[PDB]
């Protein structure tokens, strides 16, 4: 029943600027109203580009009031180039005074869960509950950022998978992603749906069919992005290419 907003920008650069400015404003707003912002970060070129923009325009925010979580990450070493958290570190977090006690990265392959990816996912579920309000099992994320693949995948939720079918668990292990690397930890649709707002930031014609399918009410098991819905609103931030199958 929540509101849906679709914004279209000329190209990837205009999209990233607009999305990064929207994020700066959303963080400022949450700090002004509650003295706290809870943001779920994503990986991917566009998602990281948005963080580089935030560094450019909002380095002066009070980061001690900003708390960051991840929607997914790759089960590889901490400083591996394929880590979403390390990419956000290099794009933004290492360049500001951001206390590490506020940073909540997912486990990596050196975290001593070893081959037990499911235990690693349980651990992140425990972290979500510890950082939630009393009696809640997940923070009320102010914004969950998302990228989307050409098949509509979001976080590491792929079509026709157990992860996208999960209705109870908030975090699960993915042993078999068809996009490299195969092993990830991911927030599920129920976790995404704890967010006040979910923003999908999407660029390129290769994604236009999936965007249209998702806006057009596909089953999330067929097109995972269709399940990515905020409590207050869902926001599609597109370039014209990614929007080219919408009206
Ligand atoms: Na604080
Ligand atoms: Na931490």
Which ligand is nearest the CA of 36, by number?
Answer: 1
Which ligand is nearest the CA of 63, by number?
Answer: 1
**Side-chain half-sphere CA neighbours of 7 within 13 A:** 16
Q: Which domain holds residue 244?
A: 1-247
85, 53 in Cβ contact below 8 A? no
3-state helix/strand/coil string of the chain: CCEEEEEEECCHHHHHHHHHHHHHHHHHHHHHHHCCEEEEECCCHHHHHHHHHHHHHHCCCCHHHEEEEECEEECCCCCCCCCHHHHHHHHCHHHCCCCHHHEECCCCCCCCCCCCHHHHHHHHHHHHHHCCCCCCCCCCCCEEEECCCCCCCECCECCCCHHHHCCCCCEEEECCCCCCCCCEEEECHHHHCCCCEEEEEECCHHHHHHHHHHHCCCCCCCCHHHHCCCCCEEEEEEECCCCCCCC
In DSSP terms, 212 is beta-bridged to: none
Distance 127 CA to ligand 1 centre (A): 18
Structure tokens at 127: 């972290």
Distance 123 CA to ligand 2 centre (A): 12
Say which CATH number the domain at 38 has: 3.40.50.1360
Q: How was this structure determined?
A: X-ray
Which position has the token pair 């109203």?
33
> Rounded distance, CA 109 to CA 114, Å?
6
Distance 87 CA to ligand 2 centre (A): 15
> Rounded distance, CA 169 to CA 7, Å?
32
Number of domains in the chain: 1
- Which has the closest alpha carbon to 171: 157, 187, 194? 187
Distance 125 CA to ligand 2 centre (A): 14
245, 8 in Cβ contact below 8 A? no
Distance 189 CA to ligand 1 centre (A): 28
Q: How far is CA 31 from the centre of its chain?
A: 20
98, 63 in Cβ contact below 8 A? yes
Structure tokens at 73: 């990450």
> Rounded distance, CA 75 to CA 159, Å?
20
- Which has the closest alpha carbon to 189: 207, 214, 216? 214
Which ligand is nearest the CA of 98, by number?
Answer: 1
* Resolution given for this structure, in angstroms: 1.5
> Rounded distance, CA 136 to CA 117, Å?
24
3-state helix/strand/coil string of 51-87: HHHHHHHHCCCCHHHEEEEECEEECCCCCCCCCHHHH
- Which has the closest alpha carbon to 244: 203, 194, 214, 190? 203
């Amino acid at each position: 029943m929540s509101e849906t907003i679709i914004e279209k920008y000329a190209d990837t650069d205009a999209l990233v600027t607009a999305a990064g400015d929207r994020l700066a404003s959303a963080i400022t707003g949450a700090l002004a109203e509650r003295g706290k912002a809870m943001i779920v970060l994503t990986g991917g070129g566009t998602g990281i580009a948005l963080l580089k923009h935030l560094r450019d325009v909002a380095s002066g925010l009070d980061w001690t009031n900003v708390h960051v979580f991840w929607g997914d990450d790759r089960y590889v070493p901490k400083t591996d180039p394929e880590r979403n958290a390390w990419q956000a570190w290099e794009a933004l977090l290492e360049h500001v005074n951001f206390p590490l006690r506020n940073m909540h990265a997912m486990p990596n392959s050196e975290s001593e869960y070893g081959t037990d990816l499911d235990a690693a996912a349980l651990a992140y579920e425990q972290l979500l509950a510890a950082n939630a309000e009393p009696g809640q099992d997940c923070p009320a994320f102010d914004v969950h950022l998302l990228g989307m693949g050409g098949e509509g995948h979001i976080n590491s939720l792929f079509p026709h998978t157990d992860a996208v079918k999960e209705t109870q668990r908030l975090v699960v292990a993915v042993p078999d992603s068809p996009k490299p690397p195969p092993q990830r930890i991911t927030l599920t649709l129920p976790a995404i749906q704890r967010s006040r707002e979910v923003w999908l930031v999407v660029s390129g014609e290769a994604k236009a069919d999936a965007v249209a399918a998702a806006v057009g009410g596909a089953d999330p098991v067929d097109v995972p992005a269709a399940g990515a819905k905020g409590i207050e609103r869902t926001v599609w931030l597109l370039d014209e290419a990614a929007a080219s199958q919408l009206g």
